[PDB]
Write a protein that binds this ligand. Sequence first.
Ligand code: HEM
Ligand code: HEM
Ligand code: HEM
Lengths: 56, 379, 54, 54, 74, 65, 237, 52, 32, 98, 54
Amino acid sequence: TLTARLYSLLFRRTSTFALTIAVGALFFERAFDQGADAIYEHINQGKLWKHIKHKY
Amino acid sequence: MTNIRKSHPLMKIINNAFIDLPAPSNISSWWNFGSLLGICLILQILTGLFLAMHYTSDTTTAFSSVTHICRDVNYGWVIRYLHANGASMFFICLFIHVGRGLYYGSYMFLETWNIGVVLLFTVMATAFMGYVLPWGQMSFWGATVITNLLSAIPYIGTDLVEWIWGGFSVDKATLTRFFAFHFILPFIITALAAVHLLFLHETGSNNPTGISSDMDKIPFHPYYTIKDILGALFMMLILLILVLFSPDLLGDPDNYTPANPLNTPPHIKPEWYFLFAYAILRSIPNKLGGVLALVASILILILMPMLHTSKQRSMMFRPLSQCLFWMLVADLITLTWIGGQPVEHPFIIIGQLASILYFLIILVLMPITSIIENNLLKW
Amino acid sequence: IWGGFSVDKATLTRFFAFHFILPFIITALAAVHLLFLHETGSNNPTGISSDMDK
Amino acid sequence: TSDTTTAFSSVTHICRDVNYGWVIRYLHANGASMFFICLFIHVGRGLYYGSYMF
Amino acid sequence: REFGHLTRMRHVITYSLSPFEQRAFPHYFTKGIPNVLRRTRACILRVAPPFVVFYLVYTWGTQEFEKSKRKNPA
Amino acid sequence: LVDPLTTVREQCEQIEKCIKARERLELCDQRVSSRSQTEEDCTEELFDFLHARDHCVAHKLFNSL
Amino acid sequence: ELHAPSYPWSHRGLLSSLDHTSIRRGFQVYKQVCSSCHSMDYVAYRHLVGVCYTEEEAKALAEEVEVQDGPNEDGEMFMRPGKLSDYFPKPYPNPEAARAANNGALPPDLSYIVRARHGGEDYVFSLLTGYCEPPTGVSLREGLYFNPYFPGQAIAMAPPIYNEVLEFDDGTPATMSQVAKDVCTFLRWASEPEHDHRKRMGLKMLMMMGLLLPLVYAMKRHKWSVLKSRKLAYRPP
Amino acid sequence: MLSRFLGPRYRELARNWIPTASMWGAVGAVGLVWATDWRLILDWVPYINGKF
Amino acid sequence: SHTDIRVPDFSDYRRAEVLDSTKSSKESSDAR
Amino acid sequence: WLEGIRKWYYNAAGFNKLGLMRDDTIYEDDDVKEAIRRLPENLYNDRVFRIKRALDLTMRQQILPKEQWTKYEEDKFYLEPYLKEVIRERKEREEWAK
Amino acid sequence: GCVPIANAGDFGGYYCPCHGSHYDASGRIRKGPAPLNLEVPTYEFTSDDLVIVG
Ligand code: HEM
Ligand code: HEM
Ligand code: HEM
């Protein structure tokens, strides 16, 4: 299965487990911040400085 | 060959305290609040030290220094309100921790219970002196009322209050020495917590059944490190909900006003985690009797082992004493609510009945009810 | 470390904070120091083990 | 007080107005020098008698 | 107090499974919900009545206090 | 120029809580003015009327602002 | 005691930010109505950049004021145009001149007025919009004005806001309630200038907790399944 | 702590240690008076009261 | 009497990969 | 009547739901420790397994099935005479110490 | 801070204009919940000349 492959390739050794965690932390920070920011600026659309700055 | 975890002198101490420590296999979530307390302590030392990198204890700049921390220091509002709501979380965890000790008879561990009383007093002193530091209206006038309470002491009250002030009133010298004491005290608290754990590990933890668990001990590390981590994450969730969604829920707006010794606030209350005591002291008309009651309401924790009259240790198998315990918790809630209220009808008679009931429960009702339970079980 | 472009107010307040906290870390390190020392006891001026004359 | 407008003044206040404040101030100042004298002698002893073997 | 010298125990057998052989949330709802309800009935009359009394006392004190600040015709 | 708050206040004054409190207030106003020298004051009556009116107004005002 | 109602502010919601155009209109209200008698000691011009004004607009707003600047080569104090790093001008040299100008009352600093009041911007909105005639039986000294939301209901501030008290640059009618709402939004920002960042961090924290707490719970229960499925047998002689 | 310590041997122990206890109490009293320069009492000591 | 000792059935707690006694548990071990 | 009140309190105490006996729940002070040390081996082993089983039950936040609950008439006070003797010995030593 | 009319008074010597707590020569609250009159502190009262007050 997919999880068997993931374990055999990336999880079995602790060094490779840690490397997977580090690369995943980098890409997760990027994607999670992008998504959370988009949610926050959709909830508050038109209310923020960024939305209105282009008039001044 | 050796395992350096077991042979190395430092790692041996660490190993015996948190890795290979035999722990009861059945201690509940209520046994998490020890590890929360020590975490809160660390958080308070961490944010406070970072506050102390910008805060200044001169009365001409303290309130301004705090405004600067929250307005211009990078993430200084985070550190500030993390510190304030972490003091509130410290006291929540302390009250739950002492309530667990009461309910399960953990006070039968005499030395660690007595060290815990010392710790409660020292955390209270630290939080009290820290709250003066922003030098808001509540800071100033709460310091004023609580320090002038000590004048009730016979023959040396005024002399000792003036010595604590370093002057004729709460002023600059008081604020600077309160900053110094507030800085130093949490490290003494750390030492006392270490002594506390040293005394606890002599017997190990009590469990919810109140029965000795040596036949079912599990190693601390895999089980209670992960359980304490989960408890810490839940505590962090509550703390961050406070810090990020209602920063000012448990505080007072009048401390956003700089201290005015000419004008007093309409209401001068301690913080919430003092109100139960502030109610008790305010219930008694006599100044000194009120102070003695406000001190006995926390010294009475030293009496619990001598008040124990049950054949059983914990409250798990004693419905009547559970009833009294929950009445005690309700009376503490009503004392907190009363202490947040003005001294006027009807809160006065309510505070009086609650203050009487607190002592009547701990000192009288709980012992007699344990004896009745003893006879109901025919021993 | 400055908290700014030069040695100034930020540096002074943070130096007060670090100066307050550091001697307590030193106290803990001296306790660990003595813990390690007592594993062997003290050396002596001859440089010879003295367990027969403690 | 660690503000840059009051630090020098606060130390002057300690040495001129606080009761026995100059005693405490100069005790602290020369106790730091005594600390370093003792530290240098302590490390010199360690070097001379091979205490570093611990 | 260390493992290996805590008590004498005899004739007790324990059977355990590897965490990788079993699940971490088995019957979490089909069994957990009845257990929570059982644990709630077991204690509810020991815990709840004091807080009901506090609710009533708080409600009465607050409404009464606010009933004193009202003008009584006189 | 007309203000939203005026029309919102009138509409919310048409509320029966307001309608009852208004004549309670006008019976106080009829007493305190008849009696030549008293300590009352109709601030409590006005406070009831304003509490009702301003609850309704806080429900409806920001929609026109 | 007349407590303020709860108004449906744009920023009341848990993730709801401040409307920054209302913050800009509210700065215009403060800087044209309140500032003659109120100071904002802890808010500087630079603070308004990226919030409701561009750096050029805020530098011109700082240029509009004159601020005293420190001693010259000759040792005199001089007047210079304001700067971004300059804080908002103070209307009165000391509290005593403020009290002298306002019939004994010192008008408060408004940097924390929303935070330093129970009821916050709701209270400030109701105070600004709540000037009525004194009721029958209530008489106030001259220079005092009946306001049911002020403690004692006798306030030394005359009604500051009215219809068309100022003009708004984006063209809104400046009705009294509009002016009050704008200035109250600005005062909420002046008390808590981390509000929007605080709520964005709260959203991220709620997401991270909704991920980690199930995951740490699964970790705890994976390790504990050994104990929780354990079977015991007693086989005495 | 109620009557296990209530007996003839315990009253003998009390009497045996009463002079030592009273001497220690006098030691504490004198030390407290001297440490605090308690004029109330010290104004009576013949030569010591010269300090005041 | 030690031959009288049987491990109790753990089927209720087992992962679905290892509910069958007739199957190698290595074939799911990595996945598990 | 106290068959009622006592059996009611025994039910309400709920250590019977863990398979425990009354004497399984006594707080273990020094006198109780000596009482347990003097216990015959079979009684000691039964007590230890009952306590371990109840600890496991409360670790899982569980109670036994009702058919397995200690019935009140069958709660054996197995530790009472040992404790009584230990207490009597202590009282004798104290009556001597006087 | 609802400052009284110092040295005048509608009743006596001062009066609380913001509130109703007017003042007499003994600076007594005439009608209001202010927890006391103007505070009368520790002094050496023998004469307006000879008052150390503090
Ligand atoms: C500085 C604050 C404190 C810290 C950091 C602290 C820390 C701890 C820790 C980590 C434990 C072990 C885990 C647990 O059982 O919860 C513990 C147990 C205990 N603490 Fe505290 N504690 C503090 C304050 C107190 C207080 C105020 C009391 C009561 C007066 C107290 C009495 C106890 C008792 C009796 C136990 C043993 C409980 C048992 O095993 O049943 N402690 N403490
Ligand atoms: C025992 C742990 C501690 C507790 C319970 C505690 C409690 C408090 C409290 C309640 C406040 C007032 C917060 C507010 O403004 O509302 C405060 C302020 C402060 N504390 Fe602490 N504190 C602790 C540890 C520390 C330590 C160790 C330091 C220094 C290293 C420190 C430095 C400060 C500073 C600088 C302030 C003023 C800044 C501010 O008001 O936020 N604290 N403390
Ligand atoms: C915080 C400052 C320090 C304190 C309080 C401290 C304390 C002590 C004490 C009490 C002893 C035992 C008595 C003695 O032989 O002197 C000792 C021994 C020793 N210290 Fe230190 N020490 C400090 C700094 C140092 C330094 C800087 C070194 C050098 C790297 C050092 C290395 C040693 C050694 C090697 C010994 C054992 C000497 C022997 O037995 O021959 N210590 N220290």
